[PDB]
């Protein structure tokens, strides 16, 4: 009944287990809604997409985690219900937590015989891992295609008439693969900008699995292209002499525009994959369709984070440096005074990566403390339930320590209940006492997060409240802000704001030896979150927020942590804490005068987007770029409103803006329908992770869900003006010298001896021609002595889109023996019909 909504090449399920899931098993479904259970035969439908029972249905993709021995289920009640001998709860019942939204937590659990339980658990665990990996993919167009086809199938396959409208064009059953190809013909033959970019370099001629990448038979190709031409209207690119790109034109493109430097074999490999027409591949070329595919590939999207992973080499510094994701009033779902409080939501915080949470403990109604917003209509919850629901899902994603903040409104005997509950549920996980030798020294410093992997910490008051609870707190003492390392304070929004305004340097230095959290203000009753950037600048680590509001600050917080895998410990800028920095303690972001610093220029070029009005065919898209950051660099922009186009708007406008602090800025690209002012897509991204040269940008909807089809084609260029005589660049002022040394460059040198026309060289910043030349010739000892008749010559050719204009001659210039290469490389601007190359000639 169609394809696999989870493709086979994604799973890792062994044949026996997958076959068992498909065949099914004998299980007892447990209902907690009405305290009922029944005997049912579970199954996994043909497509790895559902779990039917009989009568019912559940969609797997909505799953978020699976648990064994979930205390929510009463084992004894089940045993009595179906008269089965005592069954070990810890290993006889498994749980599903499926929800459509970021708040819904509706469970599904079964209790089955021993091995049946083992099979179902070990199966749905891998299915859940598959789903979690799928939702983290950079490119997901194929997934969208699968969903669309399957949905259209119900009970007939999509018709060409409908497939046309689906992609936005004006009764034969269509195969899925054919369907797929059709989409390709709307992702290449509907990008005029792509062709106009291609005709600047063309000359005349004639992690994620690879298979998933949509664009990575001949007769069908042509029919699909022809049908694409008829349907499209504008910017459409509808046998004689046709151009192409060689192993040298592409190398020019990469050395000059993008910035990538690829050696020969690498570039040949890169050309091998993309070319659709097999005929043109052998000659060593890349036909227009080939260029289109090369640009839209998953190795070309804007950010550096979409394919990131933990950098274990930076999490080894003390705990007082890294930022830390956090939440506020974890249990809450709605207002601060009228709403519910769902325990299961405590997982949404930890699963998404957060490493901090709050406990509003209150005296129990029967001796067991409960959690409720103080003196309101908010419902209550069992404290032990929450404590356990944290433990089970504490370390699914990350393996780095998490800190729980404790608020006490309980009685001392009932606080001892909490003490014992923690000592039981967590046991050794909870840090009990001092751990490391460095702690027992005259100058203690916080241990690094890695040394405490999968641990847990408690923030609360510490005695110099019952002694039992207090003795559990060693590293996070809550002493009201006036050894010092363990004293962590908490400040209300406004208090911290005024502290910053009245004091920059002192507060910042304070953040260099302790933690200091922050939470929204009391006046909020609908949870309008604060813009944390004012706080992040000075070094406030734990900026707690509310995880149920679809608003800008939340997306800012989310994007801030995509880096370093998502483990939520991103090193703070070295300027604040690295003593070796030349601006250490002398940088107050609340200031507005930086005469001793050189701002760097950025040229952003919003070329054109594609399909940036989801479910809105007719409209007037505009793009709002906005540089959130320090008070001195805030600036927004825009482009002209397009008319009745959403498949491929072409604004093609350039914003030039200078910025001062590279490390800590963010961009907020946002579609805006320019007739209702209702943002219909957006995408944030830090400015230290935007790849230069032409790139692609993947958008999102308001909820921060990923939209696949919508995308913006942009070009960024980072220009740094020469540090002429007196002042060092801001980039050099803010950081140390270690980064520049570690930031070595590639240089593509032509004419290197050998068969290959060009041979990359890796060179540091302080590299001149002489050593570079030695690198050209140091390979071989055959030469008796260094012959000076090998001089680099900064060659530069001339061509622009108007091929048929002049075809001027190539400029040339001797290379100064004492000239820095890095400046030469940074001095090439492919804007005037320019492509630099550095060639060795005698």
């Amino acid at each position, epitope marked *: 009944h169609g394809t696999e909504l989870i493709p086979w090449y994604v799973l890792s399920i062994q044949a026996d287990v997958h076959q068992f899931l498909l065949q099914g098993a004998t299980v007892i479904h447990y209902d907690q809604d009405t305290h009922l259970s029944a005997r049912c035969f579970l199954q996994l439908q043909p497509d790895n997409s559902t779990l039917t029972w009989m009568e019912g249905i559940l969609d797997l993709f909505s799953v978020k985690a699976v648990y064994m021995g979930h205390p929510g289920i009463d084992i004894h009640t089940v045993c009595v219900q179906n008269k089965l001998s005592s069954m070990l709860l810890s290993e006889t019942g498994v749980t599903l937590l499926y929800g459509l939204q970021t708040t819904d937590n509706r469970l599904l659990h079964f209790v089955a015989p021993k091995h049946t339980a083992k099979m179902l658990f070990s199966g749905l665990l891998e299915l859940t891992t598959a789903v979690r990996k799928i939702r983290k993919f950079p490119d997901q167009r194929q997934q969208w295609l699968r969903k669309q086809y399957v949905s259209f199938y119900q009970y007939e396959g999509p018709t060409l008439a409908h497939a046309v409208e689906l992609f936005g064009g004006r009764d034969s059953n269509m195969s899925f693969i054919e369907f797929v190809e059709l989409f390709k013909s709307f992702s290449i033959r509907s990008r005029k900008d792509l062709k106009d970019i291609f005709d600047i370099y*063309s000359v005349p001629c*004639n992690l994620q699995p690879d298979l998933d990448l949509l664009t990575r038979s001949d007769n069908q190709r042509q029919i699909s292209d022809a049908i694409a031409a008829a349907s499209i209207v504008t910017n459409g690119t509808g046998s004689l002499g046709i151009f192409g790109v060689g192993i040298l034109q592409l190398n020019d493109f990469l050395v000059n525009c993008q910035g990538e430097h690829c050696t020969y074999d690498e570039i040949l490999s890169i050309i091998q994959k993309f070319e659709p027409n097999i005929s043109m591949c052998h000659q060593g070329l890349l036909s227009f369709e080939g260029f289109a595919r090369f640009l839209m590939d998953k190795d070309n999207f804007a950010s550096k984070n979409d394919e990131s992973r933990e950098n274990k080499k930076d999490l080894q510094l003390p705990l007082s440096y890294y930022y830390i994701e956090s939440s506020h009033n974890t249990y809450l779902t709605g207002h601060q005074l009228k709403g519910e409080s769902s325990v299961e939501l405590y997982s949404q915080v930890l699963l998404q990566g957060c490493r901090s949470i709050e406990l509003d403990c209150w005296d129990g109604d029967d001796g067991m403390p409960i959690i409720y917003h103080g003196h309101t209509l908010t419902t209550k919850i069992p404290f032990k339930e929450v404590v356990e629901a944290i433990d089970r899902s504490a370390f699914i994603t990350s393996d780095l320590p998490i800190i729980i903040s404790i608020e006490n409104h309980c009685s001392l005997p009932q606080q001892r209940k909490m003490a014992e509950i923690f000592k039981s549920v967590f046991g050794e996980k909870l840090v009990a006492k001092f751990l490391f030798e460095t702690d027992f020294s005259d100058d203690p410093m916080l241990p690094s997060p890695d040394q405490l992997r999968r641990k847990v910490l408690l923030k609360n008051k510490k005695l110099k409240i019952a002694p039992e609870l207090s003795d559990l707190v060693i590293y996070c003492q809550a002493v009201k802000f006036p050894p010092k390392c363990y004293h962590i304070s908490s400040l209300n929004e406004n208090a911290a704001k005024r502290l910053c305004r009245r004091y920059s340097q002192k507060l910042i230095q304070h953040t260099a030896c302790q933690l200091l959290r922050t939470y929204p203000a009391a006046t909020r009753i609908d949870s309008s979150n604060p813009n944390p950037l004012m706080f992040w600048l000075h070094g406030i680590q734990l900026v707690a927020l509310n995880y149920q509001t679809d608003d800008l600050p939340l997306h800012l917080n989310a994007a801030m942590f995509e880096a370093n895998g998502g483990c939520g410990y991103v090193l703070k800028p070295p300027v604040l804490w690295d003593k070796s920095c030349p601006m250490y303690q002398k940088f107050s972001p609340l200031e507005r005068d930086l005469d001793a610093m050189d701002p760097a220029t950025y040229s952003l070029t919003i070329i054109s987007g594609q399909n940036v009005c989801p479910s809105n065919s007719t409209g007037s898209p505009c793009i709002e770029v906005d540089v959130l950051g320090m008070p001195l660099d805030s600036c927004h922009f825009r482009t002209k409103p397009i008319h009745r186009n959403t498949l491929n708007p072409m604004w093609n406008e350039q914003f030039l803006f200078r910025v001062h602090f590279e490390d800590l800025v963010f961009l907020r690209f946002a579609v805006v329908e320019n007739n209702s002012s209702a943002i219909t897509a957006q995408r944030i991204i830090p400015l230290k992770a935007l790849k230069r040269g032409y790139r692609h940008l993947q958008l999102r909807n308001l909820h921060n869900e990923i939209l696949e089809i919508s995308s913006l084609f942009i070009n960024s260029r980072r220009m740094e003006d020469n540090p002429s005589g007196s002042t060092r660049p801001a980039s050099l002022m803010f950081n140390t010298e270690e980064r520049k040394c570690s930031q070595t460059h590639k240089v593509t040198v032509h*004419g290197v001896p050998g068969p290959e026309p060009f041979a990359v060289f890796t060179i540091n910043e302080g590299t001149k021609a002489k050593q570079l030349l030695q690198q050209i010739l140091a390979v071989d000892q055959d030469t008796k002595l260094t012959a000076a008749d090998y001089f680099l010559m900064e060659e530069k050719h001339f061509i622009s889109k108007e091929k048929n204009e002049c075809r001027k001659q190539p400029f040339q210039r001797a290379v100064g023996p004492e000239e820095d290469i890095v400046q030469i490389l940074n001095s090439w601007f492919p804007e005037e019909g320019y492509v630099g190359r550095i060639v060795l000639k005698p």
Partner: antibody
Amino acid sequence: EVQLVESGGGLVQPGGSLRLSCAASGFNFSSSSIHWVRQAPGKGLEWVASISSSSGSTSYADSVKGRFTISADTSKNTAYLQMNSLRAEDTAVYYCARSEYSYQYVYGWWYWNYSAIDYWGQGTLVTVSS
Amino acid sequence: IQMTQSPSSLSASVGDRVTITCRASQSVSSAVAWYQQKPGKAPKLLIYSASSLPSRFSGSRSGTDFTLTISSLQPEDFATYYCQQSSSSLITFGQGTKVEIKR
């Protein structure tokens, strides 16, 4: 100012292999198409091949495909027409000449045609006697 | 592709008009020239497309006919004349025609 020196022709038995080079200068070889055209004595003119240099795409005639191999070296600004298993009718004069293209792009992509054979080399003779 | 260079040869008195017929098997747009070669030397160019540069040479076309016209014949004009086109990349030549003096 354009100079096209072609050398390497001569005599060789049937079935022999041979190559004719054509040095150039003045005009940027990297942006110009090189050629070879031959003339058996007392007969018309015959086109040999066409190598677009940087592009690499090559186009031989419909009479001697194969045994004639065409290559180029943009770095050295030379060309190389490698001939394999020479036959009797290889006995003729070999001429190397550049050319240029006149792009004629239409409502769509761009197109390119050879326009003007505006130079020729001095001339070299290849003979095959058995 | 095909080319024609009729007539193959002729003889004329100095100062007269010379006309050469070079017809193609099919329309080849405007890719036709006229190359001259004195014996013992590499040929040379005269014309690309229609005319364009020799002071009395010209070229005009009619349907599928490409013509070279010399307004006034000159003595040194004794040489061979070729017509060659270029479809996409296929250098084809005419039969070649020879011009001399008559007595």
